[PDB]
Amino acid sequence: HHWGYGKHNGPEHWHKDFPIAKGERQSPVDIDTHTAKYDPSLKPLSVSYDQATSLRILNNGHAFNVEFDDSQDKAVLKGGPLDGTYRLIQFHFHWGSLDGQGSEHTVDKKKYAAELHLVHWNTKYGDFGKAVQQPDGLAVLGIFLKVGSAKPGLQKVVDVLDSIKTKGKSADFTNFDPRGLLPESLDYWTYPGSLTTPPLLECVTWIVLKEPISVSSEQVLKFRKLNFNGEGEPEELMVDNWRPAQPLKNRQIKASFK
Ligand SMILES: Cc1cn([C@H]2C[C@H](n3cc(CNC(=O)Nc4cccc(S(N)(=O)=O)c4)nn3)[C@@H](CO)O2)c(=O)[nH]c1=O
Ligand SMILES: [Zn+2]
């Protein structure tokens, strides 16, 4: 009886196995755009993905991860609210059963159809597993998806999903360029938070871009054909794999822009 997104194992249950679910810096949150303060001291984000080396795509039973070689400074995030250098390890998405829901963060209570998380770890801690034990261990770049025009740079991901339909399946996934998933503007909100899935560790500097990317209805429909289940198990569509907004508590969301 493992955690998931069902009635008997979803977000409202997670606190029994993971009591930090009710902690002081949980994610995601609602971004109240009028309460966020412009912080003129925040630096432009530096996204350096030219040498990124994707390796594999994995259905892990809660999402799919596109994994990168993080054994060298090849795809890094720095600047913005960050001190030092954070290396890209994986990206994944959260999405809905319908276009009206699916994001984890919300903006003035608006839910987007999906949310992309580009996960990076602070190189001063040596590896991802040590980084997640630190309050500044991770930097997650969050990007909202809305349904409209297709995102051409997403299609290579969409077209491999048939090969990883079920939990535990992986496929080689080399030469994928994550620059093709970024919006034009790097304007962002930032706040201290957590992983949005168990173990819900309070180790993330969240950087949420204001500008969504557009994907087509056909692209998100292919996300919704994935399965939570393993092969030869009852089919349960991988949809609504998002945690709802958590209390802000004693936190301030800062804006990079006026
Ligand atoms: C000890 C050790 C552990 N590890 C990893 C595996 C282990 N783990 C992974 C999951 C699944 N949960 C997520 O992946 N959550 C998540 C991870 C990153 C971002 C986000 S999100 N949605 O907020 O963007 C969520 N459950 N447990 C995690 C902490 O225990 O550290 C390692 O790589 N090397 C090690 O030496
Ligand atoms: Zn995520």
Please compute, for residue 85, the number of CA atoms within 13 A of its CA located in the half-sphere on the CB side. Answer: 13
Assess whether the C-beta atom of 89 lies below 6 angstroms from ligand 1: no
Please, where are the H alpha helices in the chain?
Answer: 128-131, 155-160, 217-223
Separation between Cα atoms, residue 4 and residue 21, nearest integer Å:
14
Assess whether the C-beta atom of 116 lies below 6 angstroms from ligand 1: no
Angle at the Cα of 63 from the Cα atoms of 60 and 66, rounded to 5 degrees: 80
Q: Are strands 106-107 and 30-31 parallel, antiparallel or unpaired?
A: parallel
The kind and range of the H/E element at 191 are strand 188-193
Query: What was the resolution (in A) of this experimentally determined structure?
Result: 1.3
Residues of each annotated binding site: 92, 94, 117, 196-197
Domain 2-258 class in CATH: alpha beta
Token duo for residue 23: 């902690």
Q: How was this structure obtained?
A: X-ray
CA distances in angstroms from 190 to 86, 151, 203, 210, listed in the order given: 15, 25, 14, 10
Atom of ligand 1 nearest to the CA of 198: 12
